[PDB]
Specification:
Layout (H helix, E strand, L loop, with lengths): L5 H7 L1 H10 L6 H11 L15 H11 L11 H12 L6
Helix pairs in contact: 2-5, 4-5
PDB class: viral protein
Keywords: helical bundle, Viral protein
Assembly: monomeric
Length: 95
């Protein structure tokens, strides 16, 4: 069907991820996208899988962490979670 992970799907369609970011008036780097998805967000212990997810509830959990007030939040990560959110909320056909 394929059980390709969400993260690998996003990498497979990277230019469209950038398009989605741009429509949110942000920009995203592929290497940071990967690091945040796989290394940083799982350490929040809010349910973010290392290989990503398109589940809006899980995206929202990360979003609340990222948007928390200094020193609790992650300004650098804002464009990234905003883009995952937009991807999930108004997705393109690849998913």
């Amino acid at each position: 069907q394929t059980v390709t992970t969400p993260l690998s799907l996003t990498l497979g369609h990277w230019k469209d991820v950038e398009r989605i970011a741009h429509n949110q008036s942000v920009d995203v780097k592929k290497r940071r996208w990967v690091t945040f998805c796989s290394a940083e967000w799982p350490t929040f212990n809010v349910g973010w899988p290392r290989d990503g997810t398109f589940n809006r509830d899980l995206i929202t959990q990360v979003k609340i962490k990222v948007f928390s007030p200094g020193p609790h939040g992650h300004p650098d990560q804002v464009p990234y979670i905003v883009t995952w959110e937009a991807l999930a909320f108004d997705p393109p056909p690849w998913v």
